[PDB]
């Protein structure tokens, strides 16, 4: 199997900036009939891959100018001369010289984008949740940046790390911004037997963590 | 304009063996190009699992030839994909996509998710996330829905009959025991809610299951 190599893993390029993704192949995708089949393809967060560039440098019908593929027997490059925000995804190396065909491992490209601090919401467990006999208290951290961020779960006062769920969209093609999802579950029982439930935030964009809370009194 | 389409069961027992059809309109399957089935595993890795050409020859992946097959039914523009003595590590998304990397002729299906698990399908539960201990003297109220314990994925989530889209953010399911557990928020602004009503509507196709659920301020 020919090994398809793709650097770097990652990009984080700001709007209106040069991008470059590199593809190594292990043997020479040169064909018999001297046509060497290298594509280039483009996974948007939430939909199906799709083709941009076909035989190493022509791009396929509504693809940008601003995209642009060469190289030559194993060496390939796709530049994109100018990043905009409907680019973000993951891009992948292709080559359909040698049987069977195989792709690199992909090339995540990130908008790099300003500071934004999370807007922090905390839900208690509806009745109707607290009938079956659990309870979940739910925690969201909309439209921030970056990524990196620290969410703690505090049950009165005391840090819980079990029975938390935490997952984070992809990043958002209008604003750049990622959100995330907090759940913290128990039984009923436990829930009833203490008073306040915090969610506790820990981003870049605040010295001191930005702090959420309810107590079973004001319900 | 050519249209692919993946179909086929989203849970598979184990040892079992996977079939899935790619419903092509749009361009007649005998008339050119290779027709392929790729599929995607969690963490981003594709692999080509074979195609079946116009002429109607095939050629397989040779990592899972002696348990592939594709095959065609002409009259009904449909190819086919089996795969057999499936085990969890099949669990993919599958993608039918039609194309001869010399041309511009390329089209890929929307991908259809299979689980390979011994597990029973499950239908979710739904509960309002309403605010707590507040009456919102912002501008804006976040108001979100809890979809708890269902089992394959995926489930669908729309706010008010899907024209309340923006403000939207619905977080990728998590895994738990066997179960999943999802959620999404809707944020508007405090002259909406309470006044006018949102409704979270989530669908289950594994479980034929259908559910509205309005969400309501709090009394306590």
């Known amino acids: 199997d020919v090994q398809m190599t793709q650097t770097p893993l990652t990009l984080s390029v700001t709007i209106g900036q040069p991008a470059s993704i590199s593809c190594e192949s292990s043997?020479?995708?040169?064909?018999?009939?001297?046509?060497?089949?290298l594509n280039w393809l483009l996974q948007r967060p939430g939909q199906s891959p799709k083709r941009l560039i076909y035989?190493?440098?022509k791009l396929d019908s509504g693809v940008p100018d601003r995209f642009t593929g060469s190289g030559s027997g194993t060496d390939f490059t796709l530049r994109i001369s100018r990043v905009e925000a409907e680019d973000l995804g993951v891009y992948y190396c292709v080559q359909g010289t040698h049987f069977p065909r195989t792709f690199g491992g992909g090339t995540k490209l990130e908008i790099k984008r300003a500071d934004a601090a999370p807007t922090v919401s905390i839900f208690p467990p509806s009745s109707e949740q607290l009938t079956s006999g659990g309870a979940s208290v739910v925690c969201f951290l909309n439209n921030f940046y970056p990524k990196d961020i620290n969410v703690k779960w505090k049950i009165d006062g005391s840090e819980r790390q079990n029975g938390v769920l935490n997952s984070w969209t992809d990043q958002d093609s209008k604003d750049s911004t990622y959100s995330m999802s907090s759940t913290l579950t128990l039984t009923k029982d436990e829930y009833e037997r203490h008073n306040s439930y915090t969610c506790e935030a820990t981003h870049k964009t605040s010295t001191s963590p930005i702090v959420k809370s309810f107590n079973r009194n004001e319900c | 304009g050519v249209q692919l389409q993946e179909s086929g069961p989203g849970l598979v027992k184990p040892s079992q063996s996977l079939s899935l059809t790619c419903t092509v309109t749009?361009?007649?399957?005998?008339?050119?190009?290779?027709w392929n089935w790729i599929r995607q595993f969690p963490g981003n890795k594709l692999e080509w699992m074979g195609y079946?050409?116009?002429?109607?020859?095939?050629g397989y992946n040779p990592s899972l030839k002696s348990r592939i097959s594709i095959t065609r039914d002409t009259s009904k523009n449909q190819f086919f994909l089996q795969l057999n003595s499936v085990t969890t590590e099949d669990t993919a998304t599958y993608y039918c996509?039609?194309?001869?990397?010399?041309?511009?002729?390329?089209?890929w299906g929307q991908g259809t998710l299979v689980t390979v698990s011994a597990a029973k399908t499950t239908p979710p539960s739904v509960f309002p996330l309403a605010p707590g201990s507040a009456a919102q003297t912002n501008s804006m109220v976040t108001l979100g829905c809890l979809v708890k314990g269902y089992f394959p994925e995926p489930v669908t989530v729309t706010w008010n009959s899907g024209s309340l889209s923006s403000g939207v953010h619905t977080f990728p399911a998590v895994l738990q025991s066997d179960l999943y557990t999802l959620s999404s928020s809707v944020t508007v602004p405090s002259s909406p809610r309470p006044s006018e009503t949102v409704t979270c509507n989530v669908a289950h196709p594994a479980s034929s299951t259908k559910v509205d659920k309005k969400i309501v301020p709090r009394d306590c």
């Open positions: 035989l190493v440098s």
């Open positions: 079946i050409t116009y002429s109607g020859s095939t």
């Open positions: 749009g361009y007649s399957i005998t008339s050119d190009y290779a």
């Open positions: 996509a039609s194309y001869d990397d010399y041309t511009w002729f390329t089209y």
């Open positions: 043997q020479s995708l040169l064909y018999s009939n001297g046509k060497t089949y």
